[PDB]
Structure formats: structure tokens, C-alpha cells
Motif scaffolding. Structure first.
Motif, PDB file in Angstrom:
ATOM      1  N   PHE A  56      17.734  37.340   7.038  1.00 33.80           N
ATOM      2  CA  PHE A  56      17.759  38.038   8.318  1.00 33.80           C
ATOM      3  C   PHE A  56      19.182  38.445   8.678  1.00 33.80           C
ATOM      4  O   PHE A  56      19.407  39.519   9.234  1.00 33.80           O
ATOM      5  CB  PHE A  56      17.178  37.144   9.415  1.00 33.80           C
ATOM      6  CG  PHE A  56      17.241  37.745  10.793  1.00 33.80           C
ATOM      7  CD1 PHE A  56      16.275  38.641  11.219  1.00 33.80           C
ATOM      8  CD2 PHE A  56      18.258  37.403  11.668  1.00 33.80           C
ATOM      9  CE1 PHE A  56      16.325  39.190  12.488  1.00 33.80           C
ATOM     10  CE2 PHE A  56      18.315  37.949  12.940  1.00 33.80           C
ATOM     11  CZ  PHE A  56      17.346  38.842  13.348  1.00 33.80           C
ATOM     12  N   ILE A  62      23.728  45.105   8.697  1.00 35.13           N
ATOM     13  CA  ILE A  62      23.847  46.492   8.255  1.00 35.13           C
ATOM     14  C   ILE A  62      22.871  47.442   8.942  1.00 35.13           C
ATOM     15  O   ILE A  62      22.787  48.612   8.577  1.00 35.13           O
ATOM     16  CB  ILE A  62      23.677  46.629   6.727  1.00 35.13           C
ATOM     17  CG1 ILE A  62      22.224  46.356   6.323  1.00 35.13           C
ATOM     18  CG2 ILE A  62      24.654  45.708   5.996  1.00 35.13           C
ATOM     19  CD1 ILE A  62      21.883  46.817   4.918  1.00 35.13           C
ATOM     20  N   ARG A  69      22.885  56.474  12.082  1.00 32.41           N
ATOM     21  CA  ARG A  69      22.677  57.603  11.181  1.00 32.41           C
ATOM     22  C   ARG A  69      21.399  58.369  11.533  1.00 32.41           C
ATOM     23  O   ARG A  69      21.313  59.580  11.320  1.00 32.41           O
ATOM     24  CB  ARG A  69      22.670  57.144   9.719  1.00 32.41           C
ATOM     25  CG  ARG A  69      24.072  56.879   9.162  1.00 32.41           C
ATOM     26  CD  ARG A  69      24.024  56.213   7.795  1.00 32.41           C
ATOM     27  NE  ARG A  69      22.855  56.635   7.033  1.00 32.41           N
ATOM     28  CZ  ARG A  69      21.889  55.820   6.623  1.00 32.41           C
ATOM     29  NH1 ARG A  69      21.951  54.518   6.875  1.00 32.41           N
ATOM     30  NH2 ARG A  69      20.865  56.310   5.941  1.00 32.41           N
ATOM     31  N   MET A 100      13.800  55.140   9.480  1.00 26.43           N
ATOM     32  CA  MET A 100      14.507  54.174   8.644  1.00 26.43           C
ATOM     33  C   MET A 100      13.588  53.682   7.534  1.00 26.43           C
ATOM     34  O   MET A 100      14.020  53.493   6.395  1.00 26.43           O
ATOM     35  CB  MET A 100      15.013  52.989   9.473  1.00 26.43           C
ATOM     36  CG  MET A 100      16.104  53.333  10.481  1.00 26.43           C
ATOM     37  SD  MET A 100      16.923  51.861  11.138  1.00 26.43           S
ATOM     38  CE  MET A 100      15.573  51.083  12.018  1.00 26.43           C
ATOM     39  N   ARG A 103      13.228  56.389   4.863  1.00 25.39           N
ATOM     40  CA  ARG A 103      14.438  56.441   4.053  1.00 25.39           C
ATOM     41  C   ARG A 103      14.521  55.283   3.061  1.00 25.39           C
ATOM     42  O   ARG A 103      15.050  55.438   1.962  1.00 25.39           O
ATOM     43  CB  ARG A 103      15.672  56.487   4.953  1.00 25.39           C
ATOM     44  CG  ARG A 103      15.701  57.720   5.834  1.00 25.39           C
ATOM     45  CD  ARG A 103      16.980  57.814   6.638  1.00 25.39           C
ATOM     46  NE  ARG A 103      17.385  59.206   6.802  1.00 25.39           N
ATOM     47  CZ  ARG A 103      18.503  59.594   7.404  1.00 25.39           C
ATOM     48  NH1 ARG A 103      19.330  58.693   7.918  1.00 25.39           N
ATOM     49  NH2 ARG A 103      18.791  60.887   7.494  1.00 25.39           N
ATOM     50  N   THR A 116      16.002  50.377  -1.536  1.00 26.79           N
ATOM     51  CA  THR A 116      17.425  50.342  -1.235  1.00 26.79           C
ATOM     52  C   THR A 116      17.691  50.650   0.234  1.00 26.79           C
ATOM     53  O   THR A 116      17.358  51.728   0.724  1.00 26.79           O
ATOM     54  CB  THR A 116      18.217  51.303  -2.129  1.00 26.79           C
ATOM     55  OG1 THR A 116      18.031  50.937  -3.501  1.00 26.79           O
ATOM     56  CG2 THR A 116      19.687  51.230  -1.797  1.00 26.79           C
ATOM     57  N   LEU A 128      12.620  41.236   1.730  1.00 29.95           N
ATOM     58  CA  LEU A 128      12.472  41.985   2.976  1.00 29.95           C
ATOM     59  C   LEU A 128      11.470  41.309   3.910  1.00 29.95           C
ATOM     60  O   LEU A 128      11.680  41.238   5.122  1.00 29.95           O
ATOM     61  CB  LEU A 128      12.043  43.428   2.686  1.00 29.95           C
ATOM     62  CG  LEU A 128      12.073  44.417   3.854  1.00 29.95           C
ATOM     63  CD1 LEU A 128      13.457  44.472   4.486  1.00 29.95           C
ATOM     64  CD2 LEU A 128      11.645  45.797   3.389  1.00 29.95           C
ATOM     65  N   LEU A 133      10.653  40.947   8.472  1.00 29.16           N
ATOM     66  CA  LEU A 133       9.696  42.046   8.545  1.00 29.16           C
ATOM     67  C   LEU A 133       8.244  41.610   8.372  1.00 29.16           C
ATOM     68  O   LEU A 133       7.330  42.292   8.830  1.00 29.16           O
ATOM     69  CB  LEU A 133      10.048  43.141   7.532  1.00 29.16           C
ATOM     70  CG  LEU A 133      11.204  44.067   7.910  1.00 29.16           C
ATOM     71  CD1 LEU A 133      11.168  45.329   7.067  1.00 29.16           C
ATOM     72  CD2 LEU A 133      11.147  44.418   9.384  1.00 29.16           C
ATOM     73  N   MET A 228      10.097  37.863  16.226  1.00 24.62           N
ATOM     74  CA  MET A 228      11.448  37.476  15.837  1.00 24.62           C
ATOM     75  C   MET A 228      12.225  36.819  16.975  1.00 24.62           C
ATOM     76  O   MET A 228      12.782  35.736  16.804  1.00 24.62           O
ATOM     77  CB  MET A 228      12.218  38.674  15.278  1.00 24.62           C
ATOM     78  CG  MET A 228      11.971  38.918  13.799  1.00 24.62           C
ATOM     79  SD  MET A 228      12.957  40.271  13.127  1.00 24.62           S
ATOM     80  CE  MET A 228      12.304  41.672  14.039  1.00 24.62           C
TER      81      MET A 228
HETATM   82  N1   T3 Z   1      17.343  52.149   4.334  1.00 26.07           N
HETATM   83  C1   T3 Z   1      17.409  52.938   5.547  1.00 26.07           C
HETATM   84  C2   T3 Z   1      17.702  52.127   6.810  1.00 26.07           C
HETATM   85  C3   T3 Z   1      17.075  50.739   6.884  1.00 26.07           C
HETATM   86  C4   T3 Z   1      17.928  49.557   7.165  1.00 26.07           C
HETATM   87  C5   T3 Z   1      17.374  48.313   7.217  1.00 26.07           C
HETATM   88  I1   T3 Z   1      18.595  46.633   7.604  1.00 26.07           I
HETATM   89  C6   T3 Z   1      15.986  48.162   7.017  1.00 26.07           C
HETATM   90  O1   T3 Z   1      15.403  46.897   7.026  1.00 26.07           O
HETATM   91  C7   T3 Z   1      15.084  46.410   8.300  1.00 26.07           C
HETATM   92  C8   T3 Z   1      14.664  47.264   9.342  1.00 26.07           C
HETATM   93  C9   T3 Z   1      14.308  46.732  10.546  1.00 26.07           C
HETATM   94  C10  T3 Z   1      14.350  45.268  10.761  1.00 26.07           C
HETATM   95  O2   T3 Z   1      13.960  44.741  12.000  1.00 26.07           O
HETATM   96  C11  T3 Z   1      14.750  44.444   9.746  1.00 26.07           C
HETATM   97  I2   T3 Z   1      14.843  42.343   9.980  1.00 26.07           I
HETATM   98  C12  T3 Z   1      15.118  44.993   8.505  1.00 26.07           C
HETATM   99  C13  T3 Z   1      15.162  49.303   6.734  1.00 26.07           C
HETATM  100  I3   T3 Z   1      13.097  49.032   6.394  1.00 26.07           I
HETATM  101  C14  T3 Z   1      15.733  50.593   6.676  1.00 26.07           C
HETATM  102  C15  T3 Z   1      18.315  54.148   5.413  1.00 26.07           C
HETATM  103  O3   T3 Z   1      18.614  54.545   4.339  1.00 26.07           O
HETATM  104  O4   T3 Z   1      18.762  54.784   6.576  1.00 26.07           O
END
Ligand code: T3
Length: 246
Positions: A56, A62, A69, A100, A103, A116, A128, A133, A228
Motif C-alpha cells: 500500500f 506514486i 497527469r 488511471m 492507463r 505497469t 496490486l 485494491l 481502506m
Molecule cells: N498506471 C497509471 C496510473 C495508476 C497509478 C496507480 I498507484 C494505480 O494503482 C492504484 C490506484 C488506486 C489505488 O487506490 C491504489 I491502493 C492503487 C493505478 I490501477 C493506476 C498511469 O499510467 O497513469
């Protein structure tokens, strides 16, 4: 249009729609992490990592960039800019997870069976899922595996995002009519671009079903977020993450 489809012709984009298509495509490419060199630049999350505390932690550290973005993508759409502040916020909060997820899904790799995140972190279904999630991970992975045969290009991904963004049904919207009209504009250009691309039977209808699934992924994530903040502390959540999912 309706007459043209009757005869059996598959209309390709007008010059007007090509402009819209270029605009949306560029908006996506500019705000798509790691551009087109994502595979080389990705690092696999250690098999040992991963509500699992450290998993987590990695994800949430990140998510701020990933979120901004998405905002950056929207800012580059003149239609989005014509909307009032309140609606802009509502559309962004509504589509954030949907986009997101898309993507992440389009960057599924059958070889490693990973997605990724932000173009840099490669994670498995289990990782994940355990990092917060839950079943939303399963949904995103199933989508990703499913999309590989769709062979979507940057333009198609971009248009999906624009369709998700312009959802006139978000609760509390003021500009319902205008946003729906924006979406219709994107949907038409999208369908025309797909005719031009000449993919696969019933491609367009099959693609639209993915829109619905991304919709579901967003909604279940909201529920996951409630689960969560019952477990993980509140200090584990980045400020922007809190603003978007409230
Ligand atoms: N990969 C994408 C962006 C992207 C970033 C993340 I950190 C992601 O995991 C998540 C999202 C929500 C959550 O509550 C949790 I815990 C984990 C996912 I799914 C997507 C891009 O390229 O913009």
C-alpha cells in the motif's frame, strides 16, 4: 450519417474530427508517463512485497503524480476548459480512477503477467490486490488481458479517456446538456476513427462495453477506498489522493 450507414459505408473522420482527434491524442501522449519506452524503463516490484502495509505504501507514494497527469490531460482539452469550476472538479473526481485504470490496463504484459503503474512500476495481480485494491485488481487485470487483442493505439486510448471524462451523469453537474454534447462529439469522432483503422467483428460495440467496465472499476474503487480508511490510517493517504476520492 444514418443514411450513409444504411448503404453500408463506414464513415471516416471529417477534417473537423481530425482536428479534435489530433488535439485529444496529443493531450494523452504528453501526459502518458514514460511515453512509448515504458517496457525498458519499468522495474518489477519485488516478489516479496505484498491490507498489506508496505505494498500500500509503494502504491500510494506514486499515486499523486498519476493523478495530476490525469488533470493535465483534461487541461489540454479546450472543451474541458469551457466548463465552470464546479463541473470541472466533478468530472475530474469522477473519471480519475477510470482513466488511471485504463492507463494501467493498456500496459498489461502477457510475458510477465504484470501491469505497469506510472510506466515505471510493474506489479502482478496478487501484489496490486493485496496493496489495497482487492477485487478491483482482478477487474483491471481481466480488462488488460482482454484489451491486448483490441490493439488500441494512443488515439484510441485518448478517445476512451475523453469519453470517460465527459460523463454528463456525475452527481451534482450543472452543465449536463453541454457535457453530453461534448461526449457525443468524442464518440462520433471515435467511431469514425475506428472505421478508418479497420480492425475484428463488432469492434465498436465491443469497445463501448469496455467503457462500462471502466465505469464499474471506478465505482468499486470508491467502495475499496471506504474499506481502506477503515483499516489503513489516515496519515498513509497523500493529500491529493484524499481530495479526489474525498
Ligand atoms: N498506471 C497509471 C496510473 C495508476 C497509478 C496507480 I498507484 C494505480 O494503482 C492504484 C490506484 C488506486 C489505488 O487506490 C491504489 I491502493 C492503487 C493505478 I490501477 C493506476 C498511469 O499510467 O497513469
Amino acid at each position: 450519417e444514418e443514411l450513409q450507414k444504411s448503404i453500408g459505408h463506414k464513415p471516416e473522420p471529417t477534417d473537423e474530427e481530425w482536428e479534435l482527434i489530433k488535439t485529444v491524442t496529443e493531450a494523452h501522449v504528453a501526459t502518458n508517463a514514460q511515453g512509448s519506452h515504458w517496457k525498458q524503463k519499468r522495474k518489477f516490484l519485488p516478489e516479496d512485497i505484498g491490507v498489506d502495509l508496505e505494498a500500500f505504501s509503494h502504491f500510494t507514494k506514486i499515486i499523486t503524480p498519476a493523478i495530476t497527469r490525469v488533470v493535465d490531460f483534461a487541461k489540454k482539452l479546450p472543451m474541458f476548459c469551457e466548463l465552470p469550476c464546479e463541473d470541472q472538479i466533478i468530472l475530474l473526481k469522477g473519471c480519475c480512477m477510470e482513466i488511471m485504470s485504463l492507463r494501467a490496463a493498456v500496459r498489461y504484459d502477457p510475458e510477465s503477467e504484470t501491469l505497469t503503474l506510472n510506466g515505471e512500476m510493474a506489479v502482478t495481480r496478487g501484489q496490486l490486490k493485496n496493496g489495497g485494491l482487492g477485487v478491483v485488481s482482478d477487474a483491471i487485470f481481466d480488462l488488460g488481458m482482454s484489451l491486448s487483442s483490441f490493439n488500441l493505439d494512443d488515439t484510441e486510448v485518448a478517445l476512451l479517456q475523453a469519453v470517460l471524462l465527459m460523463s454528463s451523469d456525475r452527481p451534482g453537474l450543472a452543465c449536463v446538456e453541454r457535457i453530453e454534447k461534448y461526449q457525443d462529439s468524442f464518440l462520433l469522432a471515435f467511431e469514425h476513427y475506428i472505421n478508418y483503422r479497420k480492425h475484428v467483428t463488432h469492434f465498436w460495440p465491443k469497445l463501448l462495453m469496455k467503457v462500462t467496465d471502466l465505469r464499474m472499476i471506478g465505482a468499486c474503487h470508491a467502495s475499496r477506498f471506504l474499506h481502506m480508511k477503515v483499516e489503513c490510517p489516515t496519515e498513509l493517504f497523500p493529500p491529493l489522493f484524499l481530495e479526489v476520492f474525498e
